[PDB]
């Protein structure tokens, strides 16, 4: 939601008192966050081990969702 983008309470991107982005970073930590910035789409997050499709981030998404 919006009271926490970050659970590392040890995070210097992230204040724990808020539990959110203490810098102007765009996130605190995610697969897809490059420097707590929201890295760029056409990034792989997720390795597929047989026959499954890759993981590559929208970009604007820091963290890695699903996709089979």
Request: aromatic share 2%.
């Amino acid at each position: 939601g919006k009271e926490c983008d970050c659970s590392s309470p040890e995070n210097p991107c992230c204040d724990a008192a808020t539990c959110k982005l203490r810098p102007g970073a765009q996130c605190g930590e995610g697969l897809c966050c490059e420097q707590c910035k929201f890295s760029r789409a056409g990034k792989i997050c997720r390795i597929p081990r047989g026959e499954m499709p890759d993981d590559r981030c929208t970009g604007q998404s820091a963290d890695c969702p699903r996709y089979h």
